[PDB]
Amino acid sequence: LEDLKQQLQQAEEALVAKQEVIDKLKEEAEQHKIVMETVPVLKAQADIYKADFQAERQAREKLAEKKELLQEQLEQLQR
Amino acid sequence: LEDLKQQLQQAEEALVAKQEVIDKLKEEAEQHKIVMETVPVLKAQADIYKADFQAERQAREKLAEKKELLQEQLEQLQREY
Amino acid sequence: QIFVKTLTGKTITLEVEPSDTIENVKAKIQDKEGIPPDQQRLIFAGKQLEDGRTLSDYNIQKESTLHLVLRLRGGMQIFVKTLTGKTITLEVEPSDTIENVKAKIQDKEGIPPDQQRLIFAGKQLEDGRTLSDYNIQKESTLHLVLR
Amino acid sequence: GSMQIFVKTLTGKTITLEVEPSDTIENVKAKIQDKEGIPPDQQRLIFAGKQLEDGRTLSDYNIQKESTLHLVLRLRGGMQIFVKTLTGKTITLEVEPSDTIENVKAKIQDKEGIPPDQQRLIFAGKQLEDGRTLSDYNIQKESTLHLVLRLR
Amino acid sequence: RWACQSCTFENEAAAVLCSICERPRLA
Ligand SMILES: [Zn+2]
């Protein structure tokens, strides 16, 4: 009877050890989860700043246009 | 001494089970880390696209210079006398 | 009701009973932080939001955080040329007063709104006079000089 | 060959390179303008949490054999000039002064869909013929071309 | 007959784990 007792006290001392490692991996996993949430945002941040860099280009295009249409109204007046 | 045996077979049915779970938290933790390596890169991507939108602004900032310079040369040439 | 972070800068919180509209969410932010509507884009669960689709629409309830990204570009950028010919841009709204505009110039060039003095289309501008109240279109150029 | 490296865009688009103990960074962007044809100025390369500057080498920021580099496509290159079709549309192009006109025309194709056989570029009065570079026709930055069309 | 010092539930001495927590005897 009381020789098997010696090993079922190590068995639940091992469950304690194993759990402790479970706790730490979970605890850890959550600290890393905080940093993994920003990801979805930054991916967006990128694709706002992008569509905006585009928006500035289209402001330039339309200005530089005005300017060529001026350097043809000044290209005529050369008498 | 039927429960004593039945429970050393229940005990290690549990320590297999809690190993298998610890395997999937470790495996996971790894993949978690391969998503955490992207963030350094995306934080740059932002700051590149930014500094670019800037250097594009600066271009547009200066063009407008040329543009009064033109409208003003055409207020000068328009009053020929 | 709901929380808002600013790119891992500031945290805010707001009252809106959540059948409330995105534009009238952004406005209750321009209340708190004075950042003009057009210059913020709000994000939940990976995705950005639109004006017409509301809080009730994307199923967003109590204590739920919302990530805020500061836009770079404004609605309605204008220009400032000087004597030197050193050229600057501002981002503004048609409702903004001149006492306001000067403070933005001070922001970038470090010069006080006391001494700054602005001119447009043969007319010296005085303050508490909105941009609609000086017929300011988009991409205008204001000549500016010191005292 | 002493060694090689791997290089990825943001997606799954992985490539491979041959580089010595210590080659300069610009040289690596240039081997990319030799396998992908992306101009040097339009790439920035990343390792650890840091970008890589033009003048410095690989030995200098610790790179061992068959490590990876992350690549981000810039949004615009050194030069931008303009092209004004008779439609009343003006579009914008990205270049460098060493780029050939047959290069430029191929970019116009890519945006308006029209082949560089049935194209011609003209600047400030007079006719552009090809092989010759932009620097060779004295093309400033933010200078504008007029464009017109051919047969056969 | 023991109380799992996680969810304090009167558990059977026969059980090595919790009926709720899957949590051991000594923690
Ligand atoms: Zn329990």
Author numbering:
A (entry chain D): 260 to 338
B (entry chain B): 260 to 340
C (entry chain C): 2 to 148
D (entry chain G): -1 to 150
E (entry chain K): 353 to 379
Task: Show the paper's wording.
Ubiquitination of NEMO by the linear ubiquitin chain assembly complex (LUBAC) is essential for activating the canonical NF-κB signaling pathway. In the canonical pathway, the IKK complex is composed of two catalytic (IKKα and IKKβ) and a regulatory subunit, IKKγ or NF-κB essential modulator (NEMO). HOIP is the main catalytic subunit of LUBAC. Although the catalytic domain of HOIP is sufficient to synthesize free ubiquitin chains in vitro, the nuclear protein localization 4 (Npl4) zinc finger 1 (NZF1) domain of HOIP plays an important role in the process of linear ubiquitination through recognizing and binding the NEMO substrate.
In the crystal structure, a NEMO dimer binds two linear diubiquitins on either side of the UBAN and a HOIP NZF1 at a region upstream of the UBAN domain. The NZF1-binding site is distinct and separated from the UBAN domain by ~ 25 Å on the NEMO coiled-coil axis. Each linear diubiquitin interacts with UBAN through the Ile44 hydrophobic patch as well as the C-terminal tail of the distal ubiquitin and the Phe4-centered surface of the proximal ubiquitin. The HOIP NZF1-binding site covers a surface area of ~ 516 Å2 on the NEMO dimer, involving amino acid residues ranging from Gln266 to Asp282 in the interactions with NZF1. The NEMO-binding site on HOIP NZF1 is centered on a region located at the C-terminus of the Npl4 zinc finger, encompassing residues Glu374, Arg375, Pro376, and Arg377. However, unlike linear diubiquitin, only one NZF1 binds to NEMO in the heteropentameric structure (2:2 stoichiometry for NEMO:diubiquitin vs. 2:1 stoichiometry for NEMO: NZF1). Interestingly, in the heteropentameric crystal structure, the proximal ubiquitin from a linear diubiquitin of a symmetry-related molecule uses its Ile44 surface to interact with HOIP NZF1. Notably, the ubiquitin-binding site on NZF1 is distinct from the NEMO-binding site, and amino acid residues from HOIP interacting with ubiquitin and NEMO are not overlapping. Interestingly, in the NEMO/HOIP NZF1/linear diubiquitin complex crystal structure, the C-terminal tail of the proximal ubiquitin bound to HOIP NZF1 is in the proximity of NEMO Lys285, which is one of the two lysine residues reported as linear ubiquitination sites on human NEMO3. The observation suggests that HOIP NZF1 recognizes the monoubiquitinated NEMO and guides the catalytic domains to the ubiquitination site to catalyze the synthesis of linear ubiquitin chains.
